[PDB]
Design an enzyme around this catalytic site. Structure first.
Site, PDB file in Angstrom:
ATOM      1  N   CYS A   9      24.397   3.663  -1.028  1.00  0.00           N
ATOM      2  CA  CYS A   9      25.646   3.696  -0.298  1.00  0.00           C
ATOM      3  C   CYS A   9      25.569   2.742   0.845  1.00  0.00           C
ATOM      4  CB  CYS A   9      26.046   5.161   0.062  1.00  0.00           C
ATOM      5  SG  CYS A   9      27.693   5.356   0.886  1.00  0.00           S
ATOM      6  N   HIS A  10      25.637   3.241   2.088  1.00  0.00           N
ATOM      7  CA  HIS A  10      25.236   2.457   3.251  1.00  0.00           C
ATOM      8  C   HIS A  10      23.737   2.541   3.553  1.00  0.00           C
ATOM      9  CE1 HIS A  10      29.559   3.334   3.826  1.00  0.00           C
ATOM     10  NE2 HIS A  10      29.597   2.077   4.250  1.00  0.00           N
ATOM     11  N   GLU A  20      35.283  -0.001   1.595  1.00  0.00           N
ATOM     12  CA  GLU A  20      35.753   0.134   2.974  1.00  0.00           C
ATOM     13  C   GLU A  20      37.249  -0.196   3.112  1.00  0.00           C
ATOM     14  OE1 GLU A  20      32.174   0.740   5.339  1.00  0.00           O
ATOM     15  OE2 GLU A  20      33.182   1.757   3.661  1.00  0.00           O
TER      16      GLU A  20
END
Lengths: 216, 215
Positions: free
Chosen positions: B116-117, B148
């Site tokens: 993910c991040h 995003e």
């Protein structure tokens, strides 16, 4: 100009008791202080070092969701900095360099700094930018005593985790620490524009002292 | 025996306009811990401060015993799995202690994984063996910018001076490889560096990390 108070919370929401409950903010302190500033015509903002926080598991909303990071606060906006705590403050407040610039600036503006429970830990290395001295140097303060931590059975957690006490912060920064008879007493002090209290039981009294100290 | 370490983001928001706070996507760590346990692994958690929150848009033992990155003995672990949430946007790039742990696990022939991040943790994370960015000349995936924008949050990145996984890859001599949809289950193994796009990839990615350990 218009009436503004800022309440800082501990941003630390992690392991403490061991046990396995997370410490953090103690809600009742900030609720009671929130309500008292409000009932006196104060606009109240929250802030923490990182902008985050959580609730101390071993146990307004709008202002809470709208919490500022210490990075993004205008100190000049405020007449009062109120440092609330929760054993979480043991972890961040002494390193909370951004919060400390804020409180320093509010205070150099003739604003009031107030602190309860572990809140005075923020005072560690807190410099009074008008004098360049530790801001608490020569002042009397109170705050949650070591005795209270012995009572709770978490004073082992302090020496294991190398955490400090308000009394040690007092000594280290040229201040006099003054203890309540019992750890849970409603107990607070006004020393000029520096106002401190002991616990969530003192939250009312400490917020009254902060309001009063403005007119001094 | 064989020990995995899962890091969680430390930043418990705030992030969304609308006043909700980030933190960690719970889905990720659960599935990951499960798969790790399911394959013979003792799993611990860690975050930069030892603390965390749940991302407001929303085992327990390990989690109660969550470590602060400073207290961790890296050489204990065979795999480091960086879980995320948008909270990872604020701490992971400056998570010095978690980066140090991951570097050492990798330098000892362990696997670094992230979803993910999570790959933001790679921002200036040094392979201590080669002495260059760990991800240099690697391919990685991660939550894409498209995700995003889909979420609206791109102005937030711009306003708050945040990065993306793609910028992190660029900023470290890595190649970022995008899934077709930001929500695809999608995963990459590049040696012992293993990445996945989102929670949907949690299982894939931990399966990758487990396999990469024996390559």
């Amino acid at each position: 100009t218009p009436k503004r108070a800022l309440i800082s919370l501990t941003s630390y929401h992690g392991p403490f008791y061991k046990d396995g409950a997370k410490t953090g903010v103690f809600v009742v302190e900030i609720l009671r202080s929130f309500d008292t500033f409000e009932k006196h015509g104060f606009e109240v903002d929250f802030v923490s070092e990182t902008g985050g926080f959580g609730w101390d598991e071993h146990y307004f909303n709008k202002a809470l969701a709208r919490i500022k990071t210490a990075n993004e606060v205008n100190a000049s906006d405020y007449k009062v900095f109120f440092a609330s705590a929760g054993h979480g403050a043991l972890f961040d407040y002494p390193k909370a360099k951004n919060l400390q610039d804020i409180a320093s600036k509010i205070y150099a503006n003739g604003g009031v700094i107030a602190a309860i429970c572990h809140g005075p830990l923020l005072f560690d290395g807190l410099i009074d930018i008008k004098t360049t001295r530790p801001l608490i140097e020569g002042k009397a303060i109170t705050g949650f005593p070591l005795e209270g931590e012995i009572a709770l059975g978490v004073d082992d957690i302090l020496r294991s985790r190398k955490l400090t006490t308000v009394e040690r912060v007092a000594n280290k920064n040229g201040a006099k620490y003054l203890a309540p008879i019992h750890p849970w007493d409603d107990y607070s002090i006004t020393d000029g524009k520096l106002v401190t209290g002991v616990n969530a039981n003192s939250s009312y009294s400490t917020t009254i002292r902060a309001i009063n100290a403005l007119y001094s």
